[PDB]
């Protein structure tokens, strides 16, 4: 088979030494890499920029003519990644090399057979500040029809977090938008937790971390991302080969999803970044 799907809740990706490189989510589709040796026990695969090996035990072969395989498609304005059969995200502007409504396939979302994608927000250094002011960030809620968000009118807190921790506020808004449904998930509302941060406050089971109010949620999560990711050499969103996506999320397209929200916000606010 050319394509395999991840069966367990997560599965590891290994190098040729058997060292763990990363982990990917249930349902993720990986490509067989025909330039490297596979055997009965491990397949040479590629996913989201990462070339490595996976245990056959963790995979199911697909038939691309009846099973969903992720693909990319242009509507003539933007290029969309179908990350699931019923869900697409805009990743880039249309290029004249793209045929409208043709499905295109890629192991990294940058290299295609007839064109090359720039995904600049996917690789942007997150320690550089956004050119958007607090008042401009606050406008995004009306421009994208985001109702009932706990992050409404918190642009000033995102820009404070950026000033103090040296982390891009557009990234902070986009990450909280993707991770918490714009501060509307149950964990956002219960716990002012907009970035998916977990903690054992000694409390036996792993749970979402509690923050005392919306502002302390934004500032506290920024501190946690600075200390756990930025300060440890994860300084861009990236994919399964490099950046925050290697460790932050099993979803191979978490970084692409956040970059897509940054692209949409930047377009709505006049393209200053
Ligand atoms: C098509 C589209 O745009 N879909 C959107 C959804 O993606 C989105 O729902 C959110 O989806 C993300 C994944 O993209 C999901 O992220 C989970 O976040 C947790 C952290 O809270 C990660 O936990 C990691 O677990 C591993 C162990 O497996 C740990 O080692 C690691 O330390 C953990 N990370 C941290 C920081 O603690 C999960 O791996 C990760 N899950 C996946 C599958 O990647 C969010 O939880 C989703 N949020 C929801 C559902 O509210 C949705 C909502 O905005 O919008 C869709 O549009
Ligand atoms: Ca190694």
Swiss-Prot record:
This is Putative endo-beta-N-acetylglucosaminidase. It comes from the Bacteria. The gene is lytB. Belongs to the glycosyl hydrolase 73 family. Plays an important role in cell wall degradation and cell separation. It is found in: Secreted. Disulfide bonds: none annotated. Transmembrane segments: none annotated.
């Amino acid at each position: 088979a050319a394509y395999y799907q991840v069966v367990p809740v997560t599965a590891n990706v290994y190098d040729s030494d058997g060292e763990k490189l990363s982990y990917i989510s249930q349902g993720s589709v990986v490509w067989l890499d025909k330039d490297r040796k596979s055997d009965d026990k491990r397949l040479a695969i590629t996913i989201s920029g990462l070339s490595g090996y996976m245990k056959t035990e963790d995979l199911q072969a697909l038939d691309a003519s009846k099973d969903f395989i992720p693909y990319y498609e242009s509507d003539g304005h933007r290029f969309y990644h179908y990350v699931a059969q019923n869900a697409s995200i805009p990743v880039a502007s249309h290029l004249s090399d793209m045929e409208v409504g043709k499905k295109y396939y890629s192991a990294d979302g940058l290299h295609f057979d007839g064109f090359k994608l720039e995904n600049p927000f996917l690789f942007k250094d997150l320690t550089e500040a956004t050119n958007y002011s607090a008042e401009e960030l606050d406008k995004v809620f009306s421009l994208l029809n985001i109702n009932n968000s706990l992050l409404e009118n918190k642009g000033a807190t995102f820009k404070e977090a950026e000033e103090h921790y040296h982390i891009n506020a557009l990234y902070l808004l986009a990450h909280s938008a993707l991770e918490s449904n714009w501060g509307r998930s149950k964990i956002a509302k219960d716990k002012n937790n907009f970035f998916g941060i977990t903690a054992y406050d000694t409390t036996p089971y792993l749970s979402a971390k509690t923050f005392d109010d919306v502002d302390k949620g934004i500032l506290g999560a920024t501190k946690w991302i600075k200390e756990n990711y930025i300060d440890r050499g994860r300084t861009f969103l990236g994919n399964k080969a490099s950046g925050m996506n290697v460790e932050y999320a099993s979803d191979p397209y978490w970084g692409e999803k956040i970059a897509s929200v940054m692209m949409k916000i930047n377009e709505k606010l006049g393209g200053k970044d």
